[PDB]
Amino acid sequence: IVGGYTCGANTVPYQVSLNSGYHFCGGSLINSQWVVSAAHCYKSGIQVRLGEDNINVVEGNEQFISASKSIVHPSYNSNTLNNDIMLIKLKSAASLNSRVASISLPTSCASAGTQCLISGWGNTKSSGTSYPDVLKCLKAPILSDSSCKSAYPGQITSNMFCAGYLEGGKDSCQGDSGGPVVCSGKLQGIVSWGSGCAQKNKPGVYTKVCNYVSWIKQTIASN
């Protein structure tokens, strides 16, 4: 997250870190057994880390649970990042508590102009690299479809939305991929892509989770 703030330990209790020996992506806990992330975060060999604040210090509220299964969307296209969504099943259920909690899936798609909470352990610099140890947060508004398409001509599908600030300075970034975009208390987006981070006229692009609720529900009813 570039231009964000330190969230505060465990104030984003649905945020997970995906670890393959190191943190490499975020995700969102949607019930005790399942995490939503980005398909471009797929790796074999994922451990889900819940209850994290500092990802480099065991502070006492973590749960580390191996994935048993990962399910990339059947229509994921890694070239365009259309359908950039994945489900990860935990080998055992998380113990839900004040620090480890699920986020609701949406009933309706979020509206342009809504301010959402985006969070992650990704890079904090637009130019260069600095990765934080504690979770960072950003409030960013959803942009209109027309503004999103103008920013990335020929690249935005109906399964993507833009959020952020066209002047630059505030955005998600590498290492935040797969993490949540929460709007009105629901998971509406997944950190998916953008041209650099926090550059002028290049807002973040997010997977539109409301288009995937029926797939998520049928897949979790079946696995």
Task: Enumerate the known binding-site residues for substrate.
Answer: 171-172, 174-175, 177
How near is the Cβ of 53 to Ca ion at its closest, in Å? 6
Q: Does 171 bind Ca ion (CB under 5 A)?
A: no
Q: Distance between CA atoms of 181 and 184, rounded to whole angstroms? A: 10
DSSP string, 171-217: B--TT-TT-EEEETTEEEEEEEE-SSSSBTTB-EEEEEGGGGHHHHH
Buried b (16+ CB within 10 A) or exposed e, 172-194: bbbbbbbbbbbbeebbbbbbbbb
Beta carbons of 88 and 35 less than 8 angstroms apart: yes
Q: Does 52 bind Ca ion (CB under 5 A)?
A: yes
Binding residues: 52, 54, 57, 62, 171-172, 174-175, 177
Tokens at 79, concatenated: 């070239």
- Assess whether 23 carries a catalytic annotation: no
Catalytic residue among 84, 102, 119, 192: 84
How near is the Cβ of 102 to Ca ion at its closest, in Å? 20
Catalytic residue among 37, 102, 177, 192: 177
How near is the Cβ of 31 to Ca ion at its closest, in Å? 22
Per residue, what are the HEC states of 155-183? CCCCCEEEECCCCCCCECCCCCCCCEEEE
Q: Does 84 bind Ca ion (CB under 5 A)?
A: no
* 138-167 binders of Ca ion (CB under 5 A): none
- Assess whether 73 carries a catalytic annotation: no
Catalytic residue among 40, 53, 70, 192: 40
Q: Does 176 bind Ca ion (CB under 5 A)?
A: no
Q: Which residues are annotated as catalytic?
A: 40, 84, 177
